[PDB]
């Protein structure tokens, strides 16, 4: 029953700031606590970000984006296993196993996340 | 105001069947109608699937998976622009701009989808 | 979970266009002409137990990445069957460069020359040897 | 395509992709990545091409087997980038997660020895790629 979980960073774990002072992006401390609890329990935590794909481009993420992001995540005390970049950008993903951070936090608060059932058509 | 949308195929547009007779996968006709309406209105429709990644493997999706999928989508009368494969598999994606098909259908039924706002931390 | 592999099996990746077949600007893809020598050489390696992957950029500029699955793959796969090519894997969305400089790369002319002499399987890749 | 025209400038900019390991630097099994030794002739050649206006992309498989794809960003990139800075390499793009094959057979591929040879002779920029010529 160990889950394989994928989290956005921006406007999810931290809040976007248009000043783009990335190392100082502000955490949602409730998200950090919840992810850390899941990490401690033995779930796999992957972070996946589109950051930089439009601003510096795919060839520059490694140099120009990753240092400040990784440092931010350390400063806010986030535990995670995997960090993946080059996420594509859509206005919406419609996905049977997707959840927004508000629902995630609500379920974690109630202790209901680990057994929460994903969508099925049930035709 | 034109949206860039990404949809799962399995257990989203169609229902999974363990017999893996892919061409005969059953459509959620409400999903098909909703997607077609968005297509007709000018939104970009991308389908993104993990199908085959575990069963035939990434080198075989092009040969062994795509033909029956494309035929199924034609038989059900789905309109779409883009079809992408090799989707990674997670138990959950936690994403500020994600939605499950039930919420998608509910919003489309009400005429609220196009202006529905994505999640922000609002710290 | 033991997978069977010939001892000294090679994992090989081949371009399709201007490699296995010749480009034609008419873009009648199903009728692209094969280099029969390439087809024979690849088939020989397939028969010996090597893994054959085909990797193509076809369509990336003409129809775009979202359309390759629908508009490019059928005629390509049919072409490869018609020319009698044996292979294991087919991958798309290859990036486009004027040159890849790579320690384990070879152009089709060298590939054919080595295969003619029976020297391909043991041919050594580049090392700096500084 | 008249020489010196915009079209000519554009056509003469090449889009180049280089391996890092056993190409720009030499592999060492000790995996002390920051101290990997440069082929100074490769560094000079790439820097010359960078200065002349060509696009320089580096592409590496490093880490894919040792730490895995989820860890390359954290565990592999810092020491690689530092190495490339210490050796004085100029480049535009750095890409990871390269797949591994024993050989790529490709109409537009060249090994570092041929690359260096052509650069030494001033013949790289106009060197023609392979065509079947059936
Ligand atoms: Mg799904
Ligand atoms: Mg997001
Ligand atoms: Mg290499
Ligand atoms: Mg090619």
Detailed description of the structure:
4 copies of one chain form a homotetramer. Chain A is an alpha/beta fold. The first copy, chain A, has a single domain (4-110), classed as HAD superfamily/HAD-like (Rossmann fold, 3-Layer(aba) Sandwich). The first copy, chain A, has helices at 29-41, 61-75, 101-110; strands at residues 4-8, 44-48, 82-84, 92-94, 98-99. Chain A has a 3-stranded parallel sheet, with helices on one face. In chain A, α2 (61-75) links the parallel β2 and β3. The first copy, chain A, is globular and about 45 Å long. The two termini of chain A are 27 Å apart. One magnesium ion (MG) binds next to loops of chain A. One magnesium ion binds next to loops of chain A.
CATH level-two architecture of chain A = 3-Layer(aba) Sandwich
Discrete helix count of chain A: 3
Question: Helical residue percent of chain A?
Answer: 25-40%
How many beta-strand segments of chain A? Answer: 5
Shape of chain A: globular
CATH topology of chain A: Rossmann fold
- Identify the most extensive interface between protein chains: A-B, 36 and 36 residues
Chain oligomer state: homotetramer
Count of separate structural domains of chain A: 1
The portion of residues forming beta strands of chain A comes to 5-15%
Ions, cofactors, ligands: which are bound?
Answer: magnesium ion
Biggest sheet architecture of chain A = 3 strands, parallel
Q: How far apart, in Å, are the first and last alpha carbons of chain A?
A: 27 Å
- N-to-C SSE string of chain A, H for helix and E for strand: EHEHEEEH
Structural class of chain A: alpha/beta
For CATH, the homologous superfamily of chain A is named as HAD superfamily/HAD-like
